[PDB]
Every structure is written in structure tokens, then in C-alpha cells.
Amino acid sequence: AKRVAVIGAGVSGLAAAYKLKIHGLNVTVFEAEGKAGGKLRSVSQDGLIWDEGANTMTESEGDVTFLIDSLGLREKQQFPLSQNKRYIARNGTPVLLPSNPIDLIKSNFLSTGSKLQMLLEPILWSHESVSGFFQRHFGKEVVDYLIDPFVAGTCGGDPDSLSMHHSFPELWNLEKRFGSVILGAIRSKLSKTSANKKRQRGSFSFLGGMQTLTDAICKDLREDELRLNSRVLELSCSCTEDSAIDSWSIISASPHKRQSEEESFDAVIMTAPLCDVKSMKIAKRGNPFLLNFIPEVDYVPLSVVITTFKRENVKYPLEGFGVLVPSKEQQHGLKTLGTLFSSMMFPDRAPNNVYLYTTFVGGSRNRELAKASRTELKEIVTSDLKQLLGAEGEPTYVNHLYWSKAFPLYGHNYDSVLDAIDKMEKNLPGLFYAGNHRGGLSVGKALSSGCNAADLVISYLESVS
């Protein structure tokens, strides 16, 4: 009977733990926090249902489809009732975003010089930032009101400080080969097998919030499987002796109330953020194993603010999923990142005579705004909501959660970060990392790095013989 340690009870760790159990292996999951949900955190209150973390997800990954079926969550899968229409703030007011490439050249959303620069992109065309790349290829307007809002809506980050290579792999490649983005994209998408049937390829959630997914995985784990409040402090792997595959031991705190303890395992799946792996006393044989080589990864800080206005006071409502605020719009009074039209997407999340708005504040464009008092946050949100949707008066209700490290910032030296994760995995056998600082930042992707970590542990525990 082999045992596998899994540090972190986020969607990634739960994915890994689940894929592990259904294959016999006995598992133990250490969770620093008091609740299992990872960045997936749904809350239920006074006639409201909201997500303080991930709000939606997609199944572009085989593993997502697989899990949705295993746990039997199809009936709980919830799609938006509202049309898929996103808006961008331009000069300080919502403008409808173009649904497809054609409308881009056919509408007025772009200047005459931007369209010509796009159309002629096929002819006119290491550490490059998302911003630089797109700039030289399609122009500034397209970086400011298109790719910027997109990055803001994905991690709340800033185009100027993201590795183009690491952020958009599917595009860095095409340039290397084809040389001109426009041409490449066309080449491919215009000329792992699981179930599904291209049925509702859009995004979606689950009745009750994104946390429903995480809970489903937890109902298959015993109280001894899932150890909450037990944050991992140290790791230790002993080799040699009389046996084979090395042995790992975990020192987690709160063994009770301000207590410490240990346990021995055969493999360990690392799922906590890279900035948390650093503050972990890990040792090889008998002498420490210094993580000095771990580059210092930065994070996008931001808080999710929830507000609710009586429909009678929202002068200019918009139909769709929400509004993104281009960092350039700060010079127009808009201080938030963007806001989702929650009750419009999921009307059950609130009373039919009110609007539920999930707003994101802070981000790379303004870190000291994520840490504002609920009051200060309350006004920031109202202020933008007034100017964007014509929201009149006070929020009727306000709540929020602050994430000091919401998303990993795939920066310049991110080419080296990956190297360290690999150096660590190579020098400390049995240890497999599967955070979201590798595969990508999205429920779906982390889920996959979790599964992929589990069967990596599996063919390692079985390579023995």
C-alpha cells in the first residue's frame, strides 16, 4: 500500500487526489486554510449567491470533461442565461466589443490606421512582453482596447509586464514559424478524445457557485483524507537504507492547537504557489536542500467586491456578461478592472428586483487599491457603476474578499521560473509540482496539471519492480 502526499486543496490538488484514489492509491491532502475550496470560493447569504474567486470556467481540457462526468456534475453545470456580449469602457463609457474578426474591420471600434495595419499584417510581418509583440504587429489602439482588456480580464495584469512567450504560447509559436500572426491563425483554425458533442462550448459555472465542483471531489474523501488547517512547514526525504524508492515526511502545524507532527509518504504532489514553496524548510539526505535558485515570482493583488442595486436605480443597464476597464481608462475616472453582470448571467443568484454585480478592484494598475477598506471599496465600485451603468445611490449591500496574491505574474524571468520547478523535480525524486505557475491560470488548466501530476506519480511508484 503506497501513500501519496498532496500539498494544497485547490482544484489542482483535489483533481490530483481524485485521479489518484480511483486508481487505488491511498491519499492524504494537507490544506493550510480552514476550508477546502481553493481559489474556488462560493458564498451564500441574504438572498445572494456569489463567488469570491473563480466565477466561471470552461471545458477545453479533456480532464475537465472527464471530471465533470465522474463526479456526475452535469445536472449542476450552469450556463449563463444572458447573451454572450462583453463591453469595453472607452473614454469612460461602455462600448460593445466586436464578436468576430470581420466586425473588427467592418465596425468603427478601430481607427482607419489600425485596420490597414491589421489587413497588411500578413505582408508587413526572447523576453518580449505581451504589449511589445502586439504593439509592433497590430498597433497601439489594438493593444490598448483589445489585448489589454483581455489580459485584465484574465489575471488583472498589465500587458507591459507579461512574457509574450509564456502568456500566449499558441501565438509565440506561429510567429516563429509562419512569421505573421494573422496568416498563421488562419492557417490553423480554418483549414485526448473524450465525450461531449461541441455542446455549449461557452464558459459556465455550477448551481451554487464555482465551489460546487470542489465540494464534489471532497465528498469522496474521508475526514482523514482531507486535513484542513494543517499547513505544511517542512519536507524531508530519506534514501538509502533497506528498501527502494525514497521516503518523504511532512511536518505540518496545527496538529491540534499550536502543535506539530509528521508522517511518511512515497510521493508528494506540490500544489501551493511557488511563493509558498519558498517558505518551506525542505531537506535532501540529511543536509538542507536550498531553494535559493527559485526566482522571486510576483503576484497580481486584487479584491472581489460584491454590490447589489435595486433595478429601479440602474438607469443604463447593459445586456451580456459584463464590462472590462482598459487600464488606459483610468484617465477617465474608471478605477476598477471590470465588473460581471452576475444576476443577469445567473438570475437565481438574487432577487428578481435587484442586480448583482461582481466587481474586481486593484490589479497591477493599482495595487494599493486592492487593500482598501470595505468602505473605500464600496465607493470605488459605486463610482464606476454610476458612470458605466448609471447606477444611482448606494449599493444596497456590499461585501468583498481581498486576495493579496490572486494570480501568478508570468513576467520576464518566467522562462527561468519553469527551469527551477524542473530542477527541483529532477533533484528531489517523487516530488511533483502541479501549481498554476506552470500550465496556466484558469480552473480548467490547473485541474489538468493536477490530473497529469497524479498519473506521473503513478508511473513512478510503479516503475519500481
Ligand X SMILES: CC(C)(C)CC(C)(C)c1ccc(OCCOCCO)cc1
Binder among 18, 30, 66, 433 for ligand FAD (CB under 6 A) = 30
Q: Is the dihedral of CA 376, 381, 386, 391 positive or negative?
A: negative
What's the CA gap between 88 and 94, in Å, rounded?
Answer: 5
Window of 6-14, 59-67, 75-83, 120-128 that interacts with ligand FAD by CB under 6 A: 6-14
Tell me which residue of 214, 207, 195 sits closest to 77, measured CA to CA. 207
* Residues 294-333 close enough to bind ligand X by CB under 6 A: 324
CA 136 to chain CA centroid, Å, is 28
On the CB side of 341, how many CA atoms lie within 13 Å of its CA? 24
> Which partner, ligand X, its own copies, ligand OMN, none, binds residue 168 by CB below 5 to 8 Å per kind?
ligand X
Binder among 8, 10, 301, 363 for ligand OMN (CB under 6 A) = 363
**Burial state string for 224-254 with b = 16 or more CB within 10 A and e = fewer than 16:** eebbbebbbebbbbeeeeeeeebebebbbbb
Binder among 4, 31, 67, 209 for ligand FAD (CB under 6 A) = 31
List for the chain the helix, strand, coil content (%; round to 5). 35, 20, 40
Binder among 154, 247, 249, 387 for ligand X (CB under 6 A) = 154
| Residue 207 beta carbon to ligand X: minimum distance, rounded to whole angstroms | 23
Q: What are phi and psi of 274, to 5 degrees?
A: -60, -30
The single-letter code of the amino acid at 246 is D
Kindly tell me which of 40 and 381 has the beta carbon lying closer to ligand FAD.
Answer: 40
Binder among 80, 94, 156, 430 for ligand OMN (CB under 6 A) = 156
Kindly tell me which of 54 and 146 has the beta carbon lying closer to ligand X.
Answer: 146
Is residue 20 within 8 A of residue 4, CB to CB? The reply is yes
Kindly tell me which of 9 and 391 has the beta carbon lying closer to ligand FAD.
Answer: 9
> Which partner, ligand FAD, ligand OMN, its own copies, none, binds residue 116 by CB below 5 to 8 Å per kind?
its own copies
Find out whether 39 is annotated in a ligand binding site. Answer: yes
Longest Cα separation, the chain? 75
> Which partner, ligand FAD, ligand X, its own copies, none, binds residue 267 by CB below 5 to 8 Å per kind?
none
| Residue 275 beta carbon to ligand X: minimum distance, rounded to whole angstroms | 24
What's the CA gap between 422 and 428, in Å, rounded?
Answer: 10
x/- letters, 114..133, toward its own copies (CB under 8 A): -xx--xx-xx----------
What's the CA gap between 205 and 78, in Å, rounded?
Answer: 5
Helices (H), 79-129: 101-106, 112-119, 121-124
Residues of this chain that interact with ligand OMN (CB under 6 A) are 86, 152-153, 155-156, 302, 321-324, 337-340, 360, 363
Residues of this chain that interact with ligand FAD (CB under 6 A) are 7-13, 30-33, 38-40, 53-57, 231-232, 271-272, 276, 304, 403, 406-407, 435-436, 441-444, 446
Q: Which residues are annotated as a binding site for FAD?
A: 8-13, 31-32, 39, 53-56, 232, 441-443
